[PDB]
Design an enzyme around this catalytic site. Structure first.
Site, PDB file in Angstrom:
ATOM      1  N   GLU A 134     -33.828  -5.220 -34.642  1.00  0.00           N
ATOM      2  CA  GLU A 134     -35.014  -4.808 -35.398  1.00  0.00           C
ATOM      3  C   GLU A 134     -35.083  -3.309 -35.745  1.00  0.00           C
ATOM      4  O   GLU A 134     -35.931  -2.588 -35.203  1.00  0.00           O
ATOM      5  CB  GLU A 134     -36.285  -5.252 -34.654  1.00  0.00           C
ATOM      6  CG  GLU A 134     -36.287  -6.737 -34.283  1.00  0.00           C
ATOM      7  CD  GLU A 134     -37.567  -7.198 -33.601  1.00  0.00           C
ATOM      8  OE1 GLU A 134     -38.319  -6.349 -33.073  1.00  0.00           O
ATOM      9  OE2 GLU A 134     -37.822  -8.421 -33.591  1.00  0.00           O
ATOM     10  N   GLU A 251     -34.552 -14.602 -33.250  1.00  0.00           N
ATOM     11  CA  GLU A 251     -35.781 -14.738 -32.474  1.00  0.00           C
ATOM     12  C   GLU A 251     -36.814 -15.551 -33.239  1.00  0.00           C
ATOM     13  O   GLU A 251     -36.961 -15.406 -34.455  1.00  0.00           O
ATOM     14  CB  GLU A 251     -36.388 -13.369 -32.149  1.00  0.00           C
ATOM     15  CG  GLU A 251     -35.615 -12.521 -31.147  1.00  0.00           C
ATOM     16  CD  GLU A 251     -36.261 -11.164 -30.915  1.00  0.00           C
ATOM     17  OE1 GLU A 251     -37.469 -11.008 -31.208  1.00  0.00           O
ATOM     18  OE2 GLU A 251     -35.561 -10.247 -30.434  1.00  0.00           O
TER      19      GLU A 251
END
Length: 309
Positions: A134, A251
């Site tokens: 991220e 995720e």
């Protein structure tokens, strides 16, 4: 090597989070027990994703050496999983200074990847290198495009065997996917996206999220809901086809505070939609807040495991 075949090999998985991506293993509640790999393999998962915080286990100044004790611990986690026939995704995760200060920390980050690629260059082809979890903040989409190419060059100078996993900026979701650029010369990479939509649903009551209680009692399952999730996935699949990059939903998950009926509906729907598209995926997560396995009682959340597997 065919990255699409590697993506099939990756298949369905689970994050072992709140472990090695804490400042130190155990700081956030989880120490990775070797036994976990038997548990995860027995449940039907193909792989594990291991969030790893290298930045707190390496020297601050050149040559930025990763501590031998920490490398040995990571070896132990990787080999423990490989031994069960599980594929393994390792990454760099929570490099906090890098996100805020990419200009200074680029050099250190790349030195970390040089050491990691070098140590695991001869490991089985079922080990995947995920560049960075991220990218966000001062590490903008443009700067991420710049950093990831340099990372690719560093890794590829050492290792042309392993498939590389490349995330998106602006926190690794769909928003920055159109901005993502993977160099044409790199031909063994999988693009990763983290999917938590609708965010207000999946994170209702999430303590670490400001004003999240406003969303409590939020449900999921309506015809409108399904349409939207399908639409967002169509966007991802379109991009995937146009750019010819395999997709990994690294995720996804819904917080415990969502009503269980909707949690099940959301989880099983996401899973079926991803598998419709032959996407690899990893549930967040194995045994903490979003956890589906109770390490004390030694039991899976049966409803959720069924939704996943």
């Amino acid at each position: 090597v065919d990255p699409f075949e590697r993506n099939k090999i990756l298949g369905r998985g689970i994050n072992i989070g709140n472990a090695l991506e804490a400042p130190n293993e155990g700081d956030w509640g989880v120490v990775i027990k070797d036994e976990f790999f038997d548990i995860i393999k027995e449940a039907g998962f193909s792989h594990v994703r291991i969030p790893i915080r290298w930045s707190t286990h390496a020297y601050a100044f050149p040559p930025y050496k990763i501590m031998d004790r920490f490398f040995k611990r990571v070896d132990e986690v990787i080999n423990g999983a490989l031994k069960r026939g599980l594929a393994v995704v390792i990454n760099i995760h929570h490099y906090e200074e890098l996100m805020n200060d990419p200009e200074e920390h680029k050099e250190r980050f790349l030195a970390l990847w040089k050491q990691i690629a070098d140590r695991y260059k001869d490991y089985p082809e079922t080990l995947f290198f995920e560049i960075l979890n991220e990218p966000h903040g001062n590490l903008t989409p443009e700067k991420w495009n710049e950093l990831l190419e340099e990372a690719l060059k560093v890794i590829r100078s050492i290792d042309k065997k392993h498939t590389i996993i490349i995330g998106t900026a602006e926190w690794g979701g769909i928003s920055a996917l159109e901005k993502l650029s993977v160099p044409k010369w790199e031909k063994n990479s999988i693009v990763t996206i983290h999917y938590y939509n609708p965010f207000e649903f999946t994170h209702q009551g999430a303590e670490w999220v400001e004003g999240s209680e406003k969303w409590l009692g939020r449900k999921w399952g309506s015809p409108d809901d399904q349409k939207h999730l399908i639409e967002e996935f169509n966007f991802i699949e379109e991009w995937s086809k146009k750019n010819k990059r395999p997709i990994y939903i690294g995720e996804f998950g819904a917080y415990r505070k969502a009503d269980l009926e909707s949690r099940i509906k959301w989880t099983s729907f996401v899973v079926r939609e991803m598998e419709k598209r032959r996407w690899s995926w990893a549930y967040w997560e194995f045994c903490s807040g979003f956890g589906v396995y109770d390490t004390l009682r030694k039991t899976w959340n049966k409803d959720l495991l069924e939704a996943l597997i």
